Amino acid sequence: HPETLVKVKDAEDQLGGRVGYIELDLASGKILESFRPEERFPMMSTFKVLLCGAVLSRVDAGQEQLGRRIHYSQNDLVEYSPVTEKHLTDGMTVGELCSAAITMSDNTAANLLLTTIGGPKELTAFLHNMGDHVTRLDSWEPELNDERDTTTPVAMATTLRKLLTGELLTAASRQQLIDWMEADKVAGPLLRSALPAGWFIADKSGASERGSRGIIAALGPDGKPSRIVVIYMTGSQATMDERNRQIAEIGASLIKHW
Ligand SMILES: [Ca+2]
Structure with missing residues (x-):
């Protein structure tokens, strides 16, 4: 229920370390909202x-x-x-x-x-x-x-947009890449847990033992992705359960305010 940037900042207050976030429009490449967009975070498995x-x-x-x-x-x-x-x-x-x-x-x-x-x-x-x-x-x-x-939220988001929509890859190869991210089996406690019925989502998560968590995703209503979201967290002593929960709550906020 709070606006997304408020929730991101709250998540950082609760967890310690740093939280980096960016929401990008897929068609235009415009940045819609961001927090620590140019600071570095560990990629983990998102690479x-x-x-x-x-x-x-x-x-x-x-x-x-x-x-x-x-x-x-x-x-x-x-x-x-x-x-x-x-x-x-x-x-x-x-x-x-x-x-x-x-x-x-x-x-x-x-x-x-x-x-x-x-x-x-x-x-x-x-x-x-x-x-x-x-x-x-x-x-x-x-x-x-x-x-x-490491990467930054805006570098990863831009790079993901170039791979998914650009003419850097052929149309068949771009589709194969988003097909594998749509079939992700291990991100269910993150953005997926906040998605309404009928939305599209393709994503890749990362975690370290260890303090860090991240997800990159392309998502949108009516079976089509229209935005890319990147969230990275690093540097805190919080549990895996706490890091997963904050990501799912940032996810709920961006959907409620879409
Ligand atoms: Ca802070």
């Missing part, structure tokens, strides 16, 4: 959407195929690999690896895909190549979680 943007850009360029099968071994597994640990014999295709990285936040899926492009610094080069000179990935999973592996 996995940017990583699969770089893989689909390779597919558009004829350098990669979503159906290409990758075989890997027990040695390649890192912490939190719920889908990849189940395919040691059959492997996964590049498309399945992106689905696992986005919809389950599978960490070995993200590492395998980072190998296909030459590592974290090459992801950062793809971002630079599209006009985002702020966002940087420096680490492999599971140890993203200083300025390493």
Whole structure:
């Protein structure tokens, strides 16, 4: 029920650390509201959407195929690999690896895909190549979680808008990317918990043990996304339950005032 910026500021007062938020109109790219839009936050698992943007850009360029099968071994597994640990014999295709990285936040899926492009610094080069000179990935999973592996709310939002609506990717690749974010399985306690019946939402969350939480999302009424929302929090000693609740309440405020 309070206006959104009031609720964001309240959330920060209750939690400590910092909360960064931006709401952007999808069609025009106008910023509708924001708080700490230019300050840095840890990306956490939200990078996995940017990583699969770089893989689909390779597919558009004829350098990669979503159906290409990758075989890997027990040695390649890192912490939190719920889908990849189940395919040691059959492997996964590049498309399945992106689905696992986005919809389950599978960490070995993200590492395998980072190998296909030459590592974290090459992801950062793809971002630079599209006009985002702020966002940087420096680490492999599971140890993203200083300025390493960070973005700002306005950099991430703008970059997500460029991937989803721009002509940087083909229409089929842009649709594949939003399809995987719409199928996200692990963000149910965040924005999803405040969405009314019939709205569209495509999202990717991030968390660290550890103090941090974030979500990036494209959402809108009547089955169509019309706004991008980015929320990042870092730096507090609050519990996971408390961080999830504040995000769901900021979500309720932006819907009630849409
Ligand atoms: Ca404050």
